[PDB]
Amino acid sequence: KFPRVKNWELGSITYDTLCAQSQQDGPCTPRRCLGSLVLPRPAEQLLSQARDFINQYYSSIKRSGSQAHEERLQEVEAEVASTGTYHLRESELVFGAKQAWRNAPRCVGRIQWGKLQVFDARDCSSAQEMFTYICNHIKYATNRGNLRSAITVFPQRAPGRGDFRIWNSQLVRYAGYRQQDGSVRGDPANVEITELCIQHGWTPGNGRFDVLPLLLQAPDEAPELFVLPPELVLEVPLEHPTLEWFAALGLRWYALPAVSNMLLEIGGLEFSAAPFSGWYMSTEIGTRNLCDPHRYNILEDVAVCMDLDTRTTSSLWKDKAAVEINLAVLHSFQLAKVTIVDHHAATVSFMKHLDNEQKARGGCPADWAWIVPPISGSLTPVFHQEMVNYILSPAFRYQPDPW
Amino acid sequence: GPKFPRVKNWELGSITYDTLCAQSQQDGPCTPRRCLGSLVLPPAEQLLSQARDFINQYYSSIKRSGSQAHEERLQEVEAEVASTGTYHLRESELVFGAKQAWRNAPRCVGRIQWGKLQVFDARDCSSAQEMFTYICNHIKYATNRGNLRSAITVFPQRAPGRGDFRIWNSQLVRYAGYRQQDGSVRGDPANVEITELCIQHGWTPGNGRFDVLPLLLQAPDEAPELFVLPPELVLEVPLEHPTLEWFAALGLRWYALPAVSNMLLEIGGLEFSAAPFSGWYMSTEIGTRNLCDPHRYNILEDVAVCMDLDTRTTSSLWKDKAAVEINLAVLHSFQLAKVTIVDHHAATVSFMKHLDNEQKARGGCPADWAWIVPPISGSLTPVFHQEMVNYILSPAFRYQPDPW
Ligand code: HEM
Ligand code: HEM
Ligand SMILES: Cc1cc(N)nc(CCc2cccc([C@H](N)Cc3cc(C)cc(N)n3)c2)c1
Ligand SMILES: Cc1cc(N)nc(CCc2cccc([C@H](N)Cc3cc(C)cc(N)n3)c2)c1
Ligand SMILES: C[C@H](O)[C@H](O)[C@H]1CNc2nc(N)[nH]c(=O)c2N1
Ligand SMILES: C[C@H](O)[C@H](O)[C@H]1CNc2nc(N)[nH]c(=O)c2N1
Ligand SMILES: [Zn+2]
């Protein structure tokens, strides 16, 4: 059945028919929904994902059935028959990476899907080479605060060997140092990776915002450590437009959100190291990273600096402080001339995206629980929009940590 | 290892498996191909099957499964269904099933309170006038001068051939929505349709933003009849802000008693078409959705202007600031007036505790994440960080089509 999809603010109705093209089961069953879970609980098969993808591609450039389409399908058939695998042409890779982003149900930034700079790093044979690539990516994507979306794609997985991998989950991450006294100094989300870096030879700092080194690993080798040159790592000091004490808290965050541990799947080929970046939405930093209890957890501190009654929930001290902190992030990013989008502008743009996708493809897979921001949900138009979630390919997938 | 879904809390890093979901006898809207969790709204041997399960549920809740009273009550129920097509609940069965429908509601965050329901049995009711009296009594009991008490009143079950008992209003207290000669709405846009119906059926309308509506009550095979609630029974709270002295001058207000009137309570296959139930409010329902939704009272811009915020740009967070202050006004005004209310922090914290109780007691809790997480400050509340499994158990409250 093609599901009915209603927006309850405007009363408007669409039908998702794009979900028919999913070939990959999600976690839900008619007996129970698991859409709030973060993680999911032959060569004939490669060949049919390859065919489907090459069809996607020739259709995308309007040359379906053409000589070139039919010859390219033979190339792939011929290559899989003989080798159990194949290779994509740069133009295909580029179309695949764009379509992976477009298909990502948890991304609120997808109106930007077509504007993606793809660096082909498949000609890479060492951790050293990977580092050089990763550095040019940072330089490009950062662009002196005028951030630009980008992916760099490292060599695909092959049956006969270990994967290329970036052990870090993002390219820029702040150390979290566990204390004898149980507590964490720095970002508690990164304690395990910090410890791995120390163990593979890094000399640690002891600050709340020590930028971490990369652990890059080429196939079947121990990973290697590379420190990022600080001048490549753009950071923004947090201040508040009206509250002067705020700056004194010493808070900061990096400009560049670059995911580096997700697998990119194209035409049934898999790219284990394929880091990608855009720009931040303020709530990611101001609400989750700084206010989550199991992150920097700065909410009391701020609320105490604001002289708020902390002794009861019903004063809404938590809510008031979170708002100011999100404000600080937006103000400081603007002042520093680094790209940021607030959650209202972002969600407005995502509604426009659903609408473009409805005309173009007949649907947009989307994960309501990740699209609605972590503060002021019902204040944003997406709260009120029903959404259908399902897995199209090309796709970004979660993968297990390599250790 | 267990082939039950694993449920994780990402704040604390703890894990459970829901085994309760195995007792679901009714499919929801999702499939392996696509998840539809975010959508608001997607007899004979059959009844006998539902009734046996419910009776079995009753006998376990009192620890007599397999007992002689148990096998006899099963026998009574097949006998009654055999000779009439339906059967009837014992009083203590109705009490149990009503509580179990509340406990089973995936969308209710207030379920730590589920054991405390007062169940008014109104299965003797025989006219619309009598529904009115029962409803008035419900409101008086539940409101209790601001010290609110959970309650439900249960009217006669659906019967074959004979028509239903039905309350046409969706809630017992609702503000009028008056459609204007331009196209705007005065009052609550949510209630334009029931307003128009009240007027068609003979109600003389007001012209305020907060006109309390009358009730359209429908006894079997009869046209609905109209009943004005006496104003003294409808407790309202005028809204003011603790420090922003101008907020009181906006004349905003809300009623104390949240009381759903159009849901069907299903127990053991039996269908109670009129069974209104009431609790108390979580502040975000009033201060965020009812007052600030674009398609409700929509006051966010007005408040932001009073607060002097820059409304010409999203990145001032003018909406976020105004919403916070409205929510605080709601909490503050309810507290000052000694009317029970719970803020979104206390509610959600209570619901985590309920989850833990229910893990021990039943091996899971059906929960709808999009509804349980509040509409402001989501990730500041612990439920944001808690995975939830959603499924249908019975007894249940189910949505039903409007009677008209
Ligand atoms: C250009 C600006 C972009 C914005 C504002 C944006 C925004 C977001 C946000 C807010 C999330 C949720 C993140 C969280 O809660 O941790 C997200 C998730 C994601 N976005 Fe983006 N995005 C952007 C660009 C991109 C690009 C360039 C890619 C890939 C090429 C991408 C792929 C994803 C994916 C795969 C996720 C899911 C991550 C996960 O599952 O952990 N987005 N996006
Ligand atoms: C005692 C205090 C209670 C609180 C604070 C409370 C809180 C809530 C909240 C916040 C919602 C979401 C409503 C919305 O978004 O419009 C809700 C839904 C609901 N609650 Fe409660 N609840 C309470 C008592 C009750 C009682 C006594 C019943 C039934 C006996 C009940 C059954 C429900 C049901 C069925 C829904 C879903 C309604 C729908 O789908 O439209 N709750 N609850
Ligand atoms: C390109 C881009 C733009 C933007 N504005 N934001 C981002 C944030 C990305 C991000 C960062 C840290 C952690 C996670 C995710 N929380 C990491 C994660 C963990 C697990 C266990 C599962 C899963 N699916 N995901 C995702 C990326
Ligand atoms: C007892 C109780 C306590 C409390 N704190 N809050 C309430 C909220 C009541 C309520 C009111 C208006 C609209 C809806 C729901 N939005 C009404 C609705 C509409 C549709 C189409 C589907 C659906 N499932 N629901 C639900 C009840
Ligand atoms: C359990 C729940 O799914 C989990 O907390 C999700 C909720 N929604 C989210 N949404 C975004 N955008 N990012 C997140 O990390 C999460 N966490
Ligand atoms: C589209 C989406 O399902 C819808 O707007 C839901 C989201 N969560 C909600 N949650 C509650 N508690 N109440 C609601 O009315 C809604 N609306
Ligand atoms: Zn689902």
DSSP output for B126-182: -SHHHHHHHHHHHHHHHHGGGS---EEEEPPPP-SSSPPPEE-SSBSS-B-EEE-SS
Tokens standing for B358?
């229910």
Distances (CA, A) of B266 to B27, B51, B118, B125: 16, 11, 17, 18
Contact residues on chain A for B340, CB-CB shorter than 8 A: none
Q: How far apart are CA A11 and CA A13, in angstroms?
A: 7
Q: Is B108 a catalytic residue?
A: yes
Q: How far apart are CA B393 and CA B267, in angstroms?
A: 10
Residues with C-beta atoms within 5 A of ion ligand 7: A 28, 33, 35; B 30, 35, 37
Environment class of B200 (CB within 10 Å of its CB; exposed 0-12, middle 13-18, buried 19+): exposed
CB B21 within 8 A of CB B4: yes
Contact residues on chain A for B7, CB-CB shorter than 8 A: 37
Active-site position among B80, B285, B301, B387: B285
Is B125 annotated to bind ligand?
A: no
Place of tokens 């709204």: B41
The three-class DSSP label of residue B307 is coil
Place of tokens 């426009």: A352
Active-site position among B103, B111, B166, B174: B111
CB A397 within 8 A of CB A269: no
CB A289 within 8 A of CB A374: no
Q: Please give the DSSP secondary-structure letter assigned to residue B89.
A: -
Among candidates B33, B366, B389 on the partner chain, residue whose Cβ is nearest the Cβ of A19: B33
Q: Active-site residue numbers of A?
A: 107, 110, 279, 284
Task: Kindly give, in sequence order, each residue whose CB lies less than 8 Å from that of residue B94, ignoring residues fewer than 6 positions away.
Answer: B119, B121, B123, B154, B267
Environment class of B146 (CB within 10 Å of its CB; exposed 0-12, middle 13-18, buried 19+): middle
CB atoms within 10 A of CB B181: 5
Contact residues on chain A for B377, CB-CB shorter than 8 A: 318-319, 322, 375-376
A214-217 and A165-166 beta bridge pairing: antiparallel
CB A57 within 8 A of CB A92: yes
Cβ separation B319–A38 shorter than 8 A: no
Is A99 annotated to bind ligand?
A: no
Q: How far apart are CA A153 and CA A94, in angstroms?
A: 10
Q: How far apart are CA A253 and CA A242, in angstroms?
A: 20
CB A26 within 8 A of CB A33: no
Among candidates B12, B328, B380 on the partner chain, residue whose Cβ is nearest the Cβ of A291: B380
Contact residues on chain A for B18, CB-CB shorter than 8 A: 32
CB proximity under 8 Å: A 250-289 to B: 287-288
Please report, for chain A, how many H helices and E strands are present, in that order. Answer: 12, 16
How many angstroms separate the most distant Cα atoms in chain A? 73
Tokens standing for B125?
């009711």
Tokens standing for B248?
């009181």
Q: How far apart are CA A77 and CA B79, in angstroms?
A: 68
CB B247 within 8 A of CB B241: yes
Place of tokens 């298909």: A103
Tokens standing for B218?
């429908």
Tokens standing for B16?
């459970």
Q: Positive or negative CA dihedral for A199, A205, A207, A208?
A: negative
φ, ψ of residue A49 to 5 degrees: the values are -65, -40
Per-residue burial over A139-173, b if 16 or more Cβ lie within 10 Å, else e, is: eebbeeeebebbbbbbbbbeeeeebbbbbbbbbbb
Cβ separation A374–B378 shorter than 8 A: yes
Chain discontinuities in chain A, listed by preceding residue (C to N exceeding 2.5 Å)? 41
Beta pairing partners, A281:
A341
Domain B18-123+150-160+264-278+348-372 in CATH: superfamily? Nitric Oxide Synthase; Chain A, domain 1 (3.90.340.10)
Domain A235-257+280-345 in CATH: superfamily? Nitric Oxide Synthase; Chain A, domain 3 (3.90.1230.10)
Closest CA to B284 of B355, B341, B213: B341
CB B30 within 8 A of CB B37: yes
Angle (nearest 5°) at CA A171 between A167 and A177 = 70
Q: How far apart are CA A384 and CA A343, in angstroms?
A: 15
Nearest CA to ligand 4 atom 21: B41
The structure's method of determination equals X-ray
Tokens standing for A181?
């006294």
Q: How far apart are CA B37 and CA A368, in angstroms?
A: 9
**Distance in Å, alpha carbon of B26 to nearest chain A alpha carbon:** 7
- For residue B265, the CA-to-ligand 4 centroid distance in Å is 14
Task: Kindly give, in sequence order, each residue whose CB lies less than 8 Å from that of residue A29, ignoring residues fewer than 6 positions away.
Answer: B30, B31, B32
First to last CA, chain B: 51
Nearest CA to ligand 6 atom 15: B371
Beta pairing partners, B57:
none
Q: How far apart are CA B254 and CA B297, in angstroms?
A: 12
CB B352 within 8 A of CB B383: yes
**Distance in Å, alpha carbon of A140 to nearest chain B alpha carbon:** 26
Is A36 annotated to bind ligand?
A: yes
Nearest CA to ligand 4 atom 5: B281
Is A82 annotated to bind ligand?
A: no
Cβ separation B317–A299 shorter than 8 A: no
Place of tokens 């808070």: A251
Helix (H) or strand (E) holding B50: helix B45-61
Q: Which CATH architecture is the domain B124-149+164-235+399-403 placed in? A: Alpha-Beta Complex (3.90)
Angle (nearest 5°) at CA A60 between A56 and A63 = 95
Place of tokens 């003011």: B240
Angle (nearest 5°) at CA B30 between B28 and B35 = 145
Angle separating helix axes A44-60 and A67-83, nearest 10 degrees: 160
Q: How far apart are CA B135 and CA B403, in angstroms?
A: 19
Q: How far apart are CA B62 and CA B77, in angstroms?
A: 18
Classify the phi-psi angles of B173: left when phi > 0, otherwise alpha if psi is within -120 to 50, otherwise beta.
beta
Chain discontinuities in chain B, listed by preceding residue (C to N exceeding 2.5 Å)? 42
**Is B42's C-beta closer than 6 angstroms to any atom of ligand 4?**
no
Torsion, Cα of A381, A383, A385, A387 (10° steps): 130
Closest CA to A251 of A195, A297, A198: A297
Q: Is the peptide bond between A394 and the residue preceding it cis, with omega within 30 degrees of 0?
A: yes
Residue to substitute in B40, B100, B107, B402 for testing ligand 2 pocket (most ligand atoms within 8 angstroms of CB): B107
Q: What is the CATH number of domain B236-258+281-346?
A: 3.90.1230.10
The three-class DSSP label of residue B325 is helix
DSSP codes joined into one string, B174-211:
-B-EEE-SSS-EEE-GGGHHHHHHHHHTT-----SSSP
- For residue A12, the CA-to-ligand 1 centroid distance in Å is 27
Cβ separation A32–B5 shorter than 8 A: yes
Q: How far apart are CA B393 and CA B21, in angstroms?
A: 8
Q: How far apart are CA B83 and CA A87, in angstroms?
A: 72
- For residue A89, the CA-to-ligand 5 centroid distance in Å is 36
Angle separating helix axes B91-103 and B45-61, nearest 10 degrees: 90
Length of chain B: 404
Task: Kindly give, in sequence order, each residue whose CB lies less than 8 Å from that of residue A62, ignoring residues fewer than 6 positions away.
Answer: none
Cβ separation B373–A378 shorter than 8 A: no
The Cβ-side half-sphere exposure at B361, using a 13 Å CA radius, reads: 11
Beta pairing partners, A264:
A271, A396
Distances (CA, A) of A399 to A260, A273, A389, A396: 11, 10, 20, 10
Q: How far apart are CA A240 and CA B5, in angstroms?
A: 44
Q: Tell me the domain boundaries of chain A.
A: 16-122+149-159+263-277+347-371, 123-148+163-234+398-402, 235-257+280-345
At position A306, the amino acid (one-letter code) is: M
B295 touches chain A (CB under 8 A): yes
Helix (H) or strand (E) holding B352: helix B344-362
* Ligand 1 pocket, residues with Cβ under 6 angstroms: A 101, 104, 106-109, 112, 149, 151, 276, 278-279, 281, 284, 341, 346, 370, 396
Scanning A276-316, the segments in alpha helix (DSSP H) are 282-283, 290-291, 299-305
Closest CA to A266 of A76, A39, A132, A400: A76
DSSP codes joined into one string, B221-245:
TS--EEEPPPGGGS-EEE---SS-G
The Cβ-side half-sphere exposure at A33, using a 13 Å CA radius, reads: 27
Classify the phi-psi angles of A201: left when phi > 0, otherwise alpha if psi is within -120 to 50, otherwise beta.
left
**Distance in Å, alpha carbon of A343 to nearest chain B alpha carbon:** 8
Closest CA to A209 of A296, A80, A311, A331: A296
Rg (CA), chain B: 23
Tokens standing for B106?
């995936």
- For residue B109, the CA-to-ligand 2 centroid distance in Å is 7
Q: Is the peptide bond between B395 and the residue preceding it cis, with omega within 30 degrees of 0?
A: yes
Q: How far apart are CA A344 and CA A355, in angstroms?
A: 17
Closest CA to B382 of B351, B342, B360: B351
**Is B171's C-beta closer than 6 angstroms to any atom of ligand 4?**
yes
Length of chain A: 403
Cβ separation A22–B28 shorter than 8 A: no
Tokens standing for A163?
């994967």
The three-class DSSP label of residue A160 is coil
Q: How far apart are CA B347 and CA A378, in angstroms?
A: 18
Place of tokens 């006004």: B329
Q: How far apart are CA A72 and CA A97, in angstroms?
A: 19
Residue to substitute in A384, A385, A387, A388 for testing ligand 6 pocket (most ligand atoms within 8 angstroms of CB): A384
At position B99, the amino acid (one-letter code) is: K
Rg (CA), chain A: 23
A38 touches chain B (CB under 8 A): yes
CB A269 within 8 A of CB A86: yes
Closest CA to A157 of A40, A18, A6, A272: A272
Please report, for chain B, how many H helices and E strands are present, in that order. Answer: 11, 16
Q: Report the residue of chain A nearest B8, measured CA to CA.
A: A37
Record: fold of A16-122+149-159+263-277+347-371: Nitric Oxide Synthase; Chain A, domain 1 (3.90.340)
CB B155 within 8 A of CB B274: yes
CB A394 within 8 A of CB A101: no
First to last CA, chain A: 43
**Is B73's C-beta closer than 6 angstroms to any atom of ligand 5?**
no
The three-class DSSP label of residue A18 is helix
Environment class of B346 (CB within 10 Å of its CB; exposed 0-12, middle 13-18, buried 19+): middle
Tokens standing for B353?
């505790």
CB proximity under 8 Å: B 307-336 to A: 314-317, 319-321, 323-324, 327-328, 331, 335
CB proximity under 8 Å: B 82-121 to A: none
Distances (CA, A) of A212 to A149, A187, A297: 22, 11, 20
Closest CA to A174 of A300, A295, A275, A330: A295
Q: Please give the DSSP secondary-structure letter assigned to residue A286.
A: I
Nearest CA to ligand 2 atom 16: B285
Adjacency order of strands within the sheet including A224-226 = A165-166, A214-217, A224-226
At position A2, the amino acid (one-letter code) is: F
Q: Positive or negative CA dihedral for B315, B316, B322, B328?
A: positive
Helix (H) or strand (E) holding B306: helix B300-306
Place of tokens 């490292």: A154
Task: Kindly give, in sequence order, each residue whose CB lies less than 8 Å from that of residue A181, ignoring residues fewer than 6 positions away.
Answer: none
Q: How far apart are CA B382 and CA B376, in angstroms?
A: 13
Closest CA to B369 of A16, A377, A340, A401: A377
Query: HEC states along A215-262?
Result: EEECCCCCCEEECCCHHHCCEEECCCCCCCHHHHCCCEEECCCEECCC
φ, ψ of residue B344 to 5 degrees: the values are -65, -20
**Is A39's C-beta closer than 6 angstroms to any atom of ligand 5?**
no
Tokens standing for B224?
């609905």
Q: Please give the DSSP secondary-structure letter assigned to residue A341.
A: B
Closest CA to A138 of A227, A72, A61, A13: A227
Per-residue burial over B263-287, b if 16 or more Cβ lie within 10 Å, else e, is: bbbbbbbbbbbbbbbbbbbbbbbbb
Per-residue burial over A334-368, b if 16 or more Cβ lie within 10 Å, else e, is: eebebbbbbbbbbbbebbebbeebbeebbbbbbbb
At position A162, the amino acid (one-letter code) is: G
Q: How far apart are CA A95 and CA A77, in angstroms?
A: 20
φ, ψ of residue B297 to 5 degrees: the values are -70, -20
Residue to substitute in A169, A292, A370 for testing ligand 5 pocket (most ligand atoms within 8 angstroms of CB): A370
Q: How far apart are CA B362 and CA B100, in angstroms?
A: 12
Q: Where are the beta strands (DSSP E) in A50-191?
A: 117-120, 150-153, 165-166, 176-178, 184-186
Contact residues on chain A for B345, CB-CB shorter than 8 A: 313-314, 318
Closest CA to A61 of A109, A100, A94, A20: A94
Distances (CA, A) of B267 to B111, B169, B276, B364: 18, 22, 15, 21
- For residue B399, the CA-to-ligand 4 centroid distance in Å is 10
Class of domain A123-148+163-234+398-402: alpha beta
CB atoms within 10 A of CB B12: 13
- For residue B286, the CA-to-ligand 7 centroid distance in Å is 28
Environment class of A6 (CB within 10 Å of its CB; exposed 0-12, middle 13-18, buried 19+): middle
Tokens standing for A325?
């902190």
Q: Please give the DSSP secondary-structure letter assigned to residue A376.
A: S
Is A218 annotated to bind ligand?
A: no
Q: How far apart are CA A118 and CA A98, in angstroms?
A: 9
For the CA of B397, the nearest ligand: 2
Closest CA to A320 of A302, A345, A293: A302
- For residue B39, the CA-to-ligand 6 centroid distance in Å is 8
Helix (H) or strand (E) holding B267: strand B264-267
CB atoms within 10 A of CB A403: 11
Place of tokens 């019967």: B159
Q: How far apart are CA A193 and CA A173, in angstroms?
A: 9
Helix (H) or strand (E) holding B328: helix B318-336
